[PDB]
């Protein structure tokens, strides 16, 4: 009864939190992922542009380096929805189990 109706309000209120800042982080990650494009896009053609992720920086041509990097923008833009979707769903859940706590108290 109530315990399982207590259990969902706890499991929600903890996990509803993170997705809220998770969208925030990716909105940020969209930016440099976009902005790291402009900075090399600032050089109209640079083949001594090195697209590399970590330690190694391999030589490539800025073009696909940008094609990656508007996606990297987009990719870093993307999950904000999911991370907002994960957000909005849980606040709706905490009150449901909160309710069947209360209505089954009253019944």
């Amino acid at each position: 009864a109530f315990t399982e109706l207590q259990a969902k309000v706890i499991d929600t209120q903890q996990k509803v939190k993170l997705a809220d800042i998770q969208i925030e982080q990716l909105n940020r990650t969209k930016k440099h992922a976009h902005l790291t494009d402009t900075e090399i896009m600032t050089l109209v053609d640079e083949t001594n542009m090195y697209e590399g992720v970590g330690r190694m920086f391999i030589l490539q041509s800025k073009e696909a380096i940008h094609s990656q990097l508007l996606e990297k923008q987009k990719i870093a833009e993307e999950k904000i929805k999911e991370l907002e979707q994960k957000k909005s769903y849980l606040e709706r859940s905490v009150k449901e189990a909160e309710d069947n706590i209360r209505e089954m108290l009253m019944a």
């Binding site: 399982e4 969902k8 499991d11 929600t12 979707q85 069947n100 019944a107």
Partner: protein, 509 residues
Amino acid sequence: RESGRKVQSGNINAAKTIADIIRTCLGPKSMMKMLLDPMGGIVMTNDGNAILREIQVQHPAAKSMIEISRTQDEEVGDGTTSVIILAGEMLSVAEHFLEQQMHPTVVISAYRKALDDMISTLKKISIPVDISDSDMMLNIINSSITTKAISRWSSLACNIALDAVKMVQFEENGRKEIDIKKYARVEKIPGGIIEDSCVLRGVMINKDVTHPRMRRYIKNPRIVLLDSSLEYKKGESQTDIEITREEDFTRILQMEEEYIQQLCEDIIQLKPDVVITEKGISDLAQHYLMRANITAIRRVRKTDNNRIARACGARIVSRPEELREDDVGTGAGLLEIKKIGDEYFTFITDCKDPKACTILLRGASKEILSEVERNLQDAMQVCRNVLLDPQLVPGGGASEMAVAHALTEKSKAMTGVEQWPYRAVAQALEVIPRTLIQNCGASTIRLLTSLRAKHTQENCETWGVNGETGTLVDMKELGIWEPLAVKLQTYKTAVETAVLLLRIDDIVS
């Protein structure tokens, strides 16, 4: 490891004392044997089934006597004493002689013809009943209760037995065999009075449902019996991975919602309020229904749901798709959480099939109720035994002295060595009359020879000695009655019972 004649003795030997001391305990007029535990625990009973127990049992055929006794204790529970009398009678008389005349065999056979003659005579000696007239039935129950001398509340419970058990009787093989008992539902209740109880329709749900969020009363919402498989499917139709993390909580619990609803909307398709959820119970299942404001009664028995299968007269539904009234909650029906005493009782009434009631019991409290229930339990079964058998017999020696003549008349006519069982069969009828002559406390040899004559002209059709009237009497005027089968049921057993130990010459380990 045991042998032959000694078995045959130990048959007659044990089955003798097996058949015996509870006949002192027999009769409305009786003699209760005392039973001492080796610790000193004392017991006073007329119940052989009880008497069978504290006594230290060794003879394995005596164990086997306990078997057909319990086997009969399963069937009636009354006459378990009386069934083992006659096998004791049977095994005593013909066996040793006719095994020293060399056979279980002619002994075996002639009890086939011991059986039928009475079975014939039974249909002659027992007269049909009005199960239509419950009073015509009531006197039986009025008679059924009083051998163990319980009247006070039973006098009502007598009627209440009649009422439900005719209703809790709906059963058909197409030859319409009615054993149906589990339909009858009984209620332990505090308060009220032993003289106030009833039978309420469908099957009232008492035992394990007090559940206060059933709502209380269902006017015409359905009750829902789920062999669904209402268990939330964490995926689309399936159960996905568990929740160890935030991501598994959002996606999976969402798909857990749909499967509940889409079935609970199929449940809503039959429009309930009360859903008693048995298979596929989910913490989301009731919660959705509780969010659906459909009271979903969980943590519940399918036995309740089988009671509820007999409460709406319905079945329970494994179908996920398209749930129906005729699927579960057959008929308009009711569901009501009632407080008799203050105990919450679900009453699901109005089975889709008529003959729908289940016995409410109120005593002044549970116990003095249990006084009713225990005796009503006897009262109610005699019904379905009279409802089983719509013939009934003037009892006592009338029941006893009738067939022996035809049986001897057979033995005289049959004049084989099978005649000898029919002689061995003849007077075995008269032992409970001896007990009846014990019951009155009179001279048996006279009353026998006297009742023997009472079958010479009257043919003891209604005439036995009734120890409780004390005298050779019409048992119809006197009103000694049982539905025919019960007589036979007592009579059928001992035959086979004797015939059973009639087979054994060998115990072996």
